[PDB]
Inverse folding.
């Protein structure tokens, strides 16, 4: 059946903005997962999970009699698709159970692990999400084997369809680099926003870079991918050594014995895949990655044997039974247990990528300290495992249940507690009046609040106006934020705040974060008034102000908007058309197409553009909140042509006279071109639409202002 | 960016069932288009449309000074995508303004027509939909030019994204037959459900079949395609001769002058396409189809000149200026006006397909009769134009405004008025009790009501339980409907009805239509009681019984379910996998994936299967309303394999014992395979879900029972 994507393969795609509708959701519209989880008997689930670890099923027999390793692997893959560049991936939505992740080659046989979990998911039903369960299972596996975890938070609600993520352009699973859709260029530079070396891998190739078994060069790939998942050297060493304390790899026979991945398998396979023709197909004969490595003498017990072996032996290159490169300690005795035959033992083995921890010089220092000081290794691994599995969960206010760690970590972008009464409605009105009396303009007010709030991304729930991090490094100096203009606005708002707080009794105070938002609300109210409409913009206090010391500057970098079509801003020149970047930003802000459309057309005429550019400012009453953008954009009396200077800027001239009326960018003019967006623009540009425009604009503005307000959830 | 569709191109696609969400819709959730239209001043819109007809715009100058022809073509094409096979296409959703239809070659320059309408759309806003406006504008064009229409109904709500329609498999626009994705096979047999001869055409090729200019062979294609659009010979001759009484074609220069269609055009084209490099590119120089024909001496006025010319001359084959085949009148004088130069005239011309109306023997008889009796021609064309443009609108209860024709037509599948008091809640309880006392079983009561109601399709809003057409030819004899069992149930229900109606005072009576549905309700109630649950199923009376004479048997044939996954029924063997057919039927029924899931799992355990098949009946308590289907389908204790006899039937055996537990079809087992469906099955198969399953099932049941109930909208 030929589709629109087939006829017009480069048209913009809006269906990313309408995923996750009420239509696809089997739960009622009022279902609240946090309420369900908060009444779950978590202790009882964990007891069930404990028992499962050593209850072997014949259709996928447990190695060593214990599923713990398989489950740690499962939970680390659940979390391990995360990319800091856009916050997509991670464990937070349980996406491992949907395409394409359920069928990535790095997730081979995790379909078995997920299936083992069904009886428990079934027992507790909607009170524990799959997303929570994958992670909880990994924790319980660690605990069952003697490892003390740092804690666990619930609150990952399940999702019901695949997320739309760019995982790369290769059309072949695992394609080595250098092909026609290579994700590398230059001196081994991986394209943003990717965080893996080959399509269908979690991070790196366990045999080495493009299969070359050189630990040193494999370390460079480890470091790069891990950094693109927000982990530094110490965290990376702790995570890899920690995880490979447990279990084993599977490569009992040649890879060609393994059949179709789950999305390709027959219907009778009932959602499982990688069925193997090698011997029994499972257990002692299992083939997963094609490597055959068991790291430690006690694969079902926490120990410090991974570093004892890594440093204690000299290693030589050998091949698994499937032909993959791996390493053996030939000088060793057969000290490693066999997974099923109590009468067999094996020599110690390692992956290329494990040897990286000893032969990369920066890693060796850390490895050695963890070898000599295994308590430091256990503490690091516990912290990094928590971070790994909670990195995309958002503000601590979303964390549920009795096991949440009390320690506040810098990576969580922490917000201080509020310990004082909040402003009320009359106070908000008085502050809005003081703000407008200061001389700050509609444009200044709207721009500053937009800049503060629109760093939010729903992918990992980082960013937003809570914290007032706009006033701190590095946000204050981001080019999009107009650093000198922003400094003048913030100074005036801070003086207002100081005056208001100084006049209060009884501990009542307003935060700067709240005032930035409220002042943007005043700007929108005044814009509506400029257009002859009295409206009240809703405003919810309770934001707090974070300090510089509570703000990791390096980790904030990935939130910098380099493209923000809402402010007609592009930091430099990109391969991807600006309209594509606009939809991407909309998806991250959780906006539908209609909400995107209303919001942009309003911001244009409020003076939100960076630099006060006239591009898209299709009004003669700037700073009045009207539907002028759409009425003028859709006026057939105006003809548009790309400029000679810049093919991405367009001039709109009167069709009869040739007089120049407006200029625009691709972001502006897509609303008059794309057939779905233009149908939207038509609604808002019609003669009956002034009231609808204003209401829908105020509603989306308020949505944006509240994106990180999980304290009010 | 590689997608799931790329990796797994034949995996089932559920996003068709979650199109048209509240997310993509710019109107608020409570917007009611019928209420908006009812307050429109239709007389005012029509005056603006009359003015527009002769308000020529320089960017697309009106032929003969009058856009009427262009607009009739625009309306005919809006309605002309309709296929009786599935009810998809047609004018009823305004899909002409979206991909792919906005860019079909046959809709070239209709983007201009649509744009001429924007000032009117804009003026009236939400009170007139694009979908209604296209049709209204065609009617007003006809009226402007002297032709009295039969009527007009409003009520076509706009839609906001492309509908998912199978338009064929060709990957080349306009591809001639016999290619790798040929829509023809055999003795020119067009594949169902298609109703056009080439990809991107409305019906036929105006040059002739695959471009060969034989009017007789063209006639065969006209007859077949028009019959696939629900028109017979009389209506087809009236429509083609009526339409080509007006206006002209456009082929002033070679097609190679015309540029990108709208979805491929640059952003500066602002939603328009087919920009031409030939001379001025418009007006006297216009290129649309490549043909250059003007049919009549008065192209802006209704006349009898089409048939005078058709019969009055002998025709010679010639070429337009673009090289296309067309016909010219032998020895004729230059009597046809030029569109722009009052000093030029032209000889009469015709398309191959116009000559079909004279050279096909059956058409010639009709054409002659219309030539001799032009009042018969006028009346038939009025009637046919109304049918054309309203065929997908559904029951008359949907028709809005002051111009709706009072005459009831056979094609509207008319339902008689109700002229008596309706049963109340006490009466409903009394009838449900008599139904349960009669001996009829849960399976019989559910099956019959399913059969009556599940004929509805939302594509053209035909079918459903109103009417009690299940008791008439041809529904009573459909294989899916189990004709002998159906007759036994109808006999018992009719005796209950007769007894009930005979005991009433005043004119209170229950229709058989209502009783069929009420009796199904009772069956679901009894099923829930069998499972130990106390459930009341909602019921809305008000259906009436249609007569056989109000039920066109040939037009009902296209509603026969040849595949009905909900009854585990497949009439024969199809190219398309049964799961694909299931989703297609769910889309027709307007169900989401969750609704499809709940409904199928319930139907299976209630005994709705055709033939009492055990396939999918995964319960030991048939006729009790439980979530057994899901709990058993997801039990990993059972292993599934395709049978030796039939690869599309599967056996579920105890994994440890080998004992046979169940059998299933692909429709059954897709719920345990497809990763989105299995996620849904899991919610309903969980230990906390029995009550939710029951409630959700009763809701979807009632939805299906009410699909055609536009008298309660
Ligand atoms: C450089 C990073 C890493 C590489 C290349 C990698 C590579 C692999 C490979 C190839 C397997 C074998 C899969 C099989 O054949 O069954 C695996 C197993 C395992 N990995 Fe990793 N690993 C990485 C990091 C991690 C991390 C961060 C964790 C967790 C903290 C982890 C935990 C495990 C566990 C527990 C297994 C055992 C699975 C079982 O017992 O079934 N690994 N690793
Ligand atoms: C066998 C069926 C038909 C064929 C093959 C056919 C073909 C065509 C073509 C090729 C054009 C020229 C397009 C252009 O170059 O501008 C056209 C124009 C038109 N047809 Fe048809 N047609 C069919 C049926 C219809 C019907 C059912 C109606 C309406 C009831 C219709 C009314 C129009 C009118 C009004 C125009 C004139 C457009 C103008 O003045 O711009 N035709 N037709
Ligand atoms: Cl994601
Ligand atoms: Cl459609
Ligand atoms: Na994420
Ligand atoms: Na339709």
């Amino acid at each position: 059946g030929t589709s629109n994507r087939d006829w017009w393969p480069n048209q913009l795609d809006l269906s990313i903005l309408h995923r996750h509708s009420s239509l696809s959701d089997p739960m009622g519209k009022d279902f609240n997962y946090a309420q369900a989880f908060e009444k779950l008997d978590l202790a009882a689930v964990k007891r069930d999970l404990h028992a499962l670890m050593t209850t072997s099923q014949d259709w996928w027999p447990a190695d060593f009699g214990h599923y713990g390793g398989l489950f740690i692997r499962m939970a680390w893959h659940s979390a391990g698709t995360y990319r800091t560049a856009d916050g997509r991936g991670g464990a937070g939505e349980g996406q491992q159970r949907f395409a394409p992740l359920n069928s990535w080659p790095d997730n081979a046989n995790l379909d078995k692990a997920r299936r083992l979990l069904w009886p428990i998911k079934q027992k507790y039903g909607r009170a524990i999400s799959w997303a929570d369960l994958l992670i909880l299972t990994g924790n319980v596996a660690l605990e069952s084997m003697g490892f003390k975890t740092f804690g666990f938070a619930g609150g990952r609600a399940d999702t019901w369809e695949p997320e739309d993520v760019y995982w790369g352009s290769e059309k072949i699973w695992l394609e080595l680099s250098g092909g026609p859709n290579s994700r590398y260029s230059g001196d081994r530079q991986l394209e943003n926003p990717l965080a893996a070396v080959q399509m269908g891998l979690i991070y790196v190739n366990p045999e080495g870079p493009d299969g070359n078994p050189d630990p040193v060069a494999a370390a460079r790939d480890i470091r790069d991918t891990f950094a693109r998942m927000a982990m530094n050297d110490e965290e990376t060493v702790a995570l890899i050594a920690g995880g490979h304390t447990f279990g084993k790899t599977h490569g009992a026979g040649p890879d060609s014995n393994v059949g179709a991945e789950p999305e390709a398998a027959g219907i009778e396979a009932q959602g499982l895949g990688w069925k193997s023709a090698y011997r029994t197909g499972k257990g002692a004969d299992a083939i997963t990655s094609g490597l055959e490595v068991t790291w430690t003498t006690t694969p079902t017990q926490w120990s410090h044997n991974f570093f004892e072996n890594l440093f204690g032996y000299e290693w030589e290159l050998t091949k698994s039974p499937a032909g993959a490169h791996q390493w053996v300690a030939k000088g060793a005795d057969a000290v490693i247990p066999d997974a099923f035959d109590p009468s067999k033992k094996h020599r110690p083995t390692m992956l290329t990528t494990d040897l990286s921890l000893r032969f990369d010089p920066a890693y060796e220092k850390i490895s050695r300290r963890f070898h000599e000081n295994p308590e430091q290794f256990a503490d690091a691994f516990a912290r990094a495992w928590f971070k790994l599995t909670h990195r995309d969960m958002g503000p601590r206010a979303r964390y549920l249940g009795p096991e949440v760690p009390a320690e506040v970590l810098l990576w969580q972008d922490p917000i201080p507690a509020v310990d004082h009464p909040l402003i009320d409605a009359a106070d908000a009105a008085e502050l809005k009046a003081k703000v407008l009396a200061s001389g700050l303009t509609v444009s200044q007010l709207v721009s500053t609040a937009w800049a503060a709030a629109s760093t939010f991304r729903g992918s990992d729930k980082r960013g937003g106006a809570n914290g007032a991090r706009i006033r701190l490094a590095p946000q204050k100096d981001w080019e999009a934020n107009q650093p000198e203009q922003l400094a003048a606005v913030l100074e005036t708002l801070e003086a207002i705040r100081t005056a208001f707080n100084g006049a209060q009794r009884g501990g009542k105070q307003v935060s700067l974060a709240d005032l930035i938002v409220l002042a943007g609300c005043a700007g929108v109210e005044q814009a509506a008034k400029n257009a002859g409409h009295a409206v009240t913009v809703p405003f919810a206090p309770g934001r707090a102000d974070a300090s510089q010391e509570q703000t990791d500057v390096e980790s904030m970098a990935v939130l910098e908007p380099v493209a923000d079509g809402f402010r007609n801003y592009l930091k430099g020149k990109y391969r991807v058309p600006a309209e594509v970047l606009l939809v991407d930003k909309a998806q991250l802000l959780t906006l539908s197409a209609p909400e995107m459309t209303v919001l942009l057309g309003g911001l244009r005429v409020l003076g939100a553009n960076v630099g006060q550019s006239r591009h898209g400012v299709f009004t003669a009453r700037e700073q009045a909140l009207t539907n002028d953008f759409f009425v003028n954009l859709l006026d057939m009396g105006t003809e548009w042509k790309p400029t000679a200077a810049d093919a991405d800027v367009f001039e709109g001239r009167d069709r009869a006279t040739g007089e120049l009326k407006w200029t625009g960018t691709r972001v502006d003019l897509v609303f008059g071109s794309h057939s779905q967006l233009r149908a939207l623009a038509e609604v808002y540009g019609s003669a009956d639409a002034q009231e609808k425009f204003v209401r829908d604009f105020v509603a989306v503005w308020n949505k944006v202002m509240n994106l990180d307000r999980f304290d009010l959830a």
Summary: The pocket of chloride ion (ligand 3) is lined by residues A 88-89, 95, 163, 165 (CB under 6 Å). The radius of gyration of chain A is 28 Å. The first strand of chain A starts at residue 184 and ends at 185. Chain A touches chain B through 91 residues (CB under 8 Å).
